[PDB]
Amino acid sequence: TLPGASWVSESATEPEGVKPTSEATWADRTLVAEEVAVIIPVHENVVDDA
Amino acid sequence: DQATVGSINLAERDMIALRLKARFAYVLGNGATAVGDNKTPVGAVVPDGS
């Protein structure tokens, strides 16, 4: 989030004489490591004969 | 330049203020003289209120 400014008047007593407060903000974006996998079964005799 | 003075918050209202101060004392030596006790070293000239 960005902060925001305002145009202000000059006054000791009126609300339009007060400078606004605002906030910047930051958030988290995250890497989570997840696993992708497979198992490929084959007969030992077929691997020997190939 | 940061203080609150009266109702005015100086920093937000973008104001500044010259505080001024002094510390003073007064005494009158209205003691005894060679003439007697409780003698006052002051005389006054005043108008009539009429």
UniProtKB/TrEMBL annotation, chain A:
Protein name as catalogued: Major capsid protein
Superkingdom of the organism of origin: Viruses
Residues of the full protein shown: 52 to 101 of 302
